[PDB]
Write a protein that binds this ligand. Structure first.
Ligand SMILES: [Zn+2]
Lengths: 103, 147, 69, 134, 304
């Protein structure tokens, strides 16, 4: 049982006590998913602040930061955004399939 | 340097932070040079209007609490300067937010009245964009330059 | 030297079009702008790679230390 | 609470090297001394010459917390009015006897009023909503 | 108020043309962050097969060894990915290449003098004076014989000139073709260019009928603006046909009578290919990568 845990990492030096504010650090990412995910987290009506930041371009590290209002922690806003981007790639893949089957 | 006496003098006597003013006349020698100059004449312009997704992205793009840039451990933002049609932040209001976050919270804001290098007639009739104004740490008037 | 395999900017395969290019300018007798458009080069990144190639390998190959001059 | 309200007659709309912001010069229709000089984002709210705007300066909207984007069924004083800004007052100036002129800065979009009676209800507060109908 | 069911009511795809090598199509009403991410993944994250390790046994020609090793890596191979797997780098070179990771190509060319009648053309004058890319023959290792029997490994462009020779000289190499992505090296990029462009918007402001409308035609590509009469005067036929030259913005007749902008959520993808995969199939891989790039973060523990 070896799941990978060096991918996503909660930076505890910038995380609030309640969990309503937290910063993360994904390895091996950049503007690709850093901007596509930031778009979908900001569509949650409880996310007060969201943004990604690449600390240096020469290494593959991606700090994102979610701050909420209340009744949803900043981890629960990350995994709600990751679910709605999984569901957003299903809509693109299934519309683009139906237009190849229609030609 | 190879001992602790010399490390205490490359941090406290010859570091770059204490070398902000040169002793020749007391003039500063450290600042942003070519294209960060020509970007602050567009960012702090009066045409700049950022939306909510964009405004929060330019804050965290430059101010990271994890690397110890903040003073509050929670990035604080401002109300938008336009409410009713569509909420929009001004580009001068980003310079307010970055000074709100990197300055210590117990001290009050800065207060400054200065000038630019750009004359008022390049901006149109009755512009006041030559006058730089900071009131309680808020940029309220004027673009930012080499000056 | 020899023609680059890919374009530097876009990355379309360009190396298979050098000998087809010299047939069009010699045999079919077109100008350079029409022969490049018939080979399929239409972005001006890949257009200036067949256009502007020197092909010095034909000048290097005259010096061969493996056969009687 | 409403600090100021009047109806203005727009006399000049100057683009002046900008694409989104036009300077508005406007005298009032009721009193003869109070003018206006306003920078509005003309993309969101287009203003021609010889218009009739309704300019209201409020102190809040009816010790609040902060700004939060609007949500289900919240009610505010901004619902009636078509263009709301939010800025501070930075300068008070008396032109002459009974010609007090106040200065606003809506994030850099400056404004200058003028008049006499408003000194009861124009303080140099860092919160002053400004709202335009029509 | 955004929702993934509200995204699905307002998302369209119009496929303009599809081909073996290119595909032009529209993505209507999607955000610039998502449309950039599909472009971003097609260039880099989509894997393809290219030669990585080249083993020279002899190179007596004029072209250097590392230059000629570099030219083989840029040759696009007509191999389907998901027929190979990924190489594993934490283990030595005897264990690293299997018949499931690796495609072994080889090249053996010798050049000789030809007896021919006479400044003569050096294909009539020498034997094997031009090494083309089709001379890289595929060597089936292990069980790559019942699984590559349908499709042998051939370069996607078989007339790529790899080297030139003169008699006496020879090239004898052997290359391993491993699977990789375009972010590592550019030779694994499965696409000539994937890119998008926004739909141009040409907003006429005043009616500009008559003789002005004839000179308004010529400021654009020919299918863009059309006329009928003084009524149905000067309208946009195909704004998608327009390239944004801003030719109309420099004639002082028209500089207030038109404004040019974009439709900010109408993207026009032009996905080409290097031959290894069809261009509509390196878009299905690209949207499935971004989905699987998000599952691996969801199905993952949040450390510390
Ligand atoms: Zn090219």
């Amino acid at each position: 049982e070896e799941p990978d845990r060096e991918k996503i990492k909660l930076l505890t030096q910038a995380t609030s006590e309640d969990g309503t504010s937290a910063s993360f650090q994904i390895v091996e990412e950049d503007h690709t998913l850093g901007n596509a995910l930031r778009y979908v987290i900001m569509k949650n009506p409880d996310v007060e602040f969201c943004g990604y930041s690449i600390p240096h371009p020469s290494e593959n590290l991606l700090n994102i930061r979610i701050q909420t209002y209340g009744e949803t922690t900043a981890v629960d806003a990350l995994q709600k955004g990751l679910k709605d981007l999984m569901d957003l790639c299903d809509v693109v893949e299934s519309k683009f399939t139906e237009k190849i089957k229609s030609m | 340097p190879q001992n602790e006496n010399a490390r205490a003098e490359a941090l406290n006597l010859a570091n770059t932070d204490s070398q902000y003013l040169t002793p020749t006349s007391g003039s500063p020698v450290r600042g942003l040079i070519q294209d960060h100059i020509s970007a602050g004449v567009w960012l702090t312009s009066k045409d700049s209007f950022f939306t909510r997704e964009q405004y929060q992205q330019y804050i965290y793009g430059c101010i990271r609490p994890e690397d110890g840039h903040t003073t509050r451990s929670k990035i604080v933002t401002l109300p938008p300067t336009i409410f009713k049609p569509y909420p929009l932040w001004t580009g001068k209001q980003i310079i307010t937010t970055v000074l709100l976050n990197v300055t210590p919270p117990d001290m009050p804001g800065i207060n400054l009245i200065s000038k630019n290098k750009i004359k008022n007639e390049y901006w149109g009739k009755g512009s006041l964009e030559n006058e730089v104004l900071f009131k309680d740490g808020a940029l309220l008037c004027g673009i930012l330059d080499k000056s | 030297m020899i023609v680059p395999v890919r374009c530097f900017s876009c990355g379309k395969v360009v190396g298979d079009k050098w000998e087809s290019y010299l047939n069009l300018l010699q045999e079919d007798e077109l100008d350079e702008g029409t022969a490049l458009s018939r080979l399929g080069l239409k972005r001006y990144c890949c257009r200036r790679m067949i256009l502007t190639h020197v092909d010095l390998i034909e000048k290097f190959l005259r010096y061969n230390p493996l056969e009687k001059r | 609470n409403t600090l100021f309200d009047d109806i203005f007659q727009v006399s000049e709309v100057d683009p002046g090297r900008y694409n989104k912001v036009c300077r508005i010069e406007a005298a009032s229709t009721t009193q003869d001394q109070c003018k206006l000089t306003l920078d509005i984002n003309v993309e969101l709210f287009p203003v021609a010459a010889q218009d009739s705007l309704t300019v209201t300066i409020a102190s809040s909207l009816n010790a609040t917390r902060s700004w939060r984007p609007p949500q289900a069924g919240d009610r505010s004083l901004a619902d009636d009015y078509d263009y709301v800004m939010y800025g501070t007052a930075y300068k008070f100036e008396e032109v002459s006897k009974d010609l007090i002129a106040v200065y606003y800065s809506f994030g850099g979009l400056l404004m200058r009023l003028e008049g006499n009676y408003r000194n009861l209800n124009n303080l140099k507060q860092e919160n002053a909503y400004l709202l335009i109908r029509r | 108020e955004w929702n993934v069911e509200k995204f699905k009511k307002d998302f369209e795809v119009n496929i303009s043309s599809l081909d073996a090598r290119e595909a032009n199509f529209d993505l209507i009403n999607i955000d610039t962050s998502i449309a950039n991410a599909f472009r971003r993944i097609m260039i880099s994250e989509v894997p393809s097969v290219a030669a990585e390790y080249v083993y020279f046994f002899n190179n007596t020609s004029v072209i250097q060894d590392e230059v000629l090793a570099h030219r083989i890596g840029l040759v696009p191979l007509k191999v389907d990915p998901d027929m190979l797997t990924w190489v594993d780098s934490n283990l030595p070179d005897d264990e690293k290449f299997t018949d499931e990771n690796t495609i072994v190509l080889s090249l053996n060319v010798k050049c000789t003098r030809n007896p021919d009648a006479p400044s003569t053309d050096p294909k009539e004058l020498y034997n094997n004076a031009h090494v083309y890319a089709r001379d890289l023959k595929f060597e089936p290792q292990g069980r790559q014989s019942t699984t590559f029997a349908d499709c042998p490994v051939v370069p996607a462009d078989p007339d790529i000139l790899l080297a030139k020779l003169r008699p006496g000289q020879e090239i004898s190499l052997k290359a391993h073709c491993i699977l990789g992505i375009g972010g590592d090296h550019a030779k694994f990029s499965p696409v000539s260019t994937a890119s998008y462009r926004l739909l141009p918007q040409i907003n006429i402001l005043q009616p500009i009928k008559g003789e002005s409308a004839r000179r308004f035609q010529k400021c654009f590509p020919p299918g863009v603006i059309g006329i009928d009469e003084g009524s149905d005067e000067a309208y946009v036929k195909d704004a998608r046909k327009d390239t944004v030259s801003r030719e109309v913005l420099r004639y002082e007749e028209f500089a207030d009578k038109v404004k040019l902008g974009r439709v900010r959520n109408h993207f026009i993808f032009n996905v080409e290919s290097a031959g290894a995969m069809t261009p509509e199939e390196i878009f299905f891989k690209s949207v499935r990568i971004l989905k699987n790039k998000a599952e691996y973060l969801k199905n993952c523990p949040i450390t510390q």
